[PDB]
Design a protein around this ligand. Sequence first.
Ligand SMILES: CCc1c[nH]c2ncnc(N3CCC[C@@H](S(C)(=O)=O)C3)c12
Length: 167
Amino acid sequence: VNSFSGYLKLTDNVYIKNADIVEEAKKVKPTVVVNAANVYLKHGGGVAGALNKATNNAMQVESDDYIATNGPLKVGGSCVLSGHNLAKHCLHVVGPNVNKGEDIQLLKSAYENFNQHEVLLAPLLSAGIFGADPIHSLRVCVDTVRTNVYLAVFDKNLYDKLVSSFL
Ligand SMILES: CCc1c[nH]c2ncnc(N3CCC[C@@H](S(C)(=O)=O)C3)c12
């Protein structure tokens, strides 16, 4: 049993809810919240901008030190950093950005990072300002992630379309 509430069950291990991932993280305080990161951990907009804002920029400060030491992530890769006031840990995952021409096949590699964590609160990778089709992102999620994932979809219209079209 866990504290996640109001989710629709899609499969054995994937759950979905119309919710602001920032508000959901603040209420649940999960072991892992996933950030929709870029390779530079520059959290300017989308989910990343919102999560970083909610940490009062502490996520960005920590991220800049990480990059200065380690260099950029790979598209499809991830790193574990602090969850600050939102979660125990933040898993920063880099899905492909279609608006940069990155290979959509890398979306599966991105979701594979979730399998290193038993339970996660997350957004749909590569959706929103990353430019991919969110229906496709949900399909890859379901077909790749085997651990327990609680997806937060900000847009109500989108949440309804994802549910109504889910096979
Ligand atoms: C600021 C956006 C946002 C705020 N809060 C959210 N909660 C869940 N999903 C979100 N997405 C919705 C838009 C696109 C995706 S994207 C590609 O940036 O990952 C982010 C958001």
